[PDB]
Design a protein around this ligand. Sequence first.
Ligand SMILES: *C/C=C(C)/C=C/C=C(C)/C=C/C1=C(C)CCCC1(C)C
Ligand SMILES: CCCCCCCC/C=C\CCCCCCCC(=O)O
Ligand SMILES: [Cl-]
Ligand SMILES: [Cl-]
Length: 264
Amino acid sequence: KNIESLFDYSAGQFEFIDHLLTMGVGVHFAALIFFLVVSQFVAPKYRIATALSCIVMVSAGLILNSQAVMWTDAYAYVDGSYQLQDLTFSNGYRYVNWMATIPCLLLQLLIVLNLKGKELFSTATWLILAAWGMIITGYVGQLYEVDDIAQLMIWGAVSTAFFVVMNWIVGTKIFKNRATMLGGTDSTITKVFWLMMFAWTLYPIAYLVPAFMNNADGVVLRQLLFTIADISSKVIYGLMITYIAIQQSAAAGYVPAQQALGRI
Ligand SMILES: *C/C=C(C)/C=C/C=C(C)/C=C/C1=C(C)CCCC1(C)C
Ligand SMILES: CCCCCCCC/C=C\CCCCCCCC(=O)O
Ligand SMILES: [Cl-]
Ligand SMILES: [Cl-]
């Protein structure tokens, strides 16, 4: 049902996609160790924001690892090209993983925004419901990326509605709570919003690839877009969230944070 299944791949195409996914695994697990070691310099009220980046690194790292092994399982070099064998490859498992990773990305944002108690629980709930609506409708949509492009588009429109409403909740909370933020991170959090808008918008662009580039090079482009988007939305984002957490920790008088920033 996926466009990947439609084509044979050149050695170049096949190896590049393998390299993209493998590099993706390496970057996320390398970043994992960074987040782990810097977590000790985060104050208790923010430390979970850094822990969530560790959780996202392993979650994303495992889905990329799984996609890479699925890629090599599904194809073999036969008569001059990589051709589909008995096992299958699908991006559908990415969508399932988003059900977990996207709530984690959203939660760590709410934490460094200094949301607490009732407002934190209510905002998280609405955000996660919006994200789940987006992911599920998008998942259904991509089941038709070969059979029914028109249906892919309509589910995509519904998904985009959830996306836009989710982004409005995010923007509203960021620009409202910006003032509460310490150590100059009221400025930094604004860049985080725009990083999110940019990186997350790459995913619906990837979703539309079967509509505007239905060929083997389109398959490569989609994996390339996922790689840019994953690294930006999880790793670069996590680094900024953790930077914000440490800076606010230091401004709040957390000595390990103050000492850590002092060494650099
Ligand atoms: C780390 C993974 C992330 C941040 C995934 C984000 C995914 C999206 C923003 C998905 C968006 C979609 C649409 C807005 C419409 C087309 C269907 C989706 C689910 C790809
Ligand atoms: C934050 C951005 C992260 C960037 C990750 C992507 C790094 C590698 C990017 C690709 C370089 C272009 C490779 C040339 C493609 C050759 C076409 C092909 O062989 O199929
Ligand atoms: Cl604290
Ligand atoms: Cl993920």
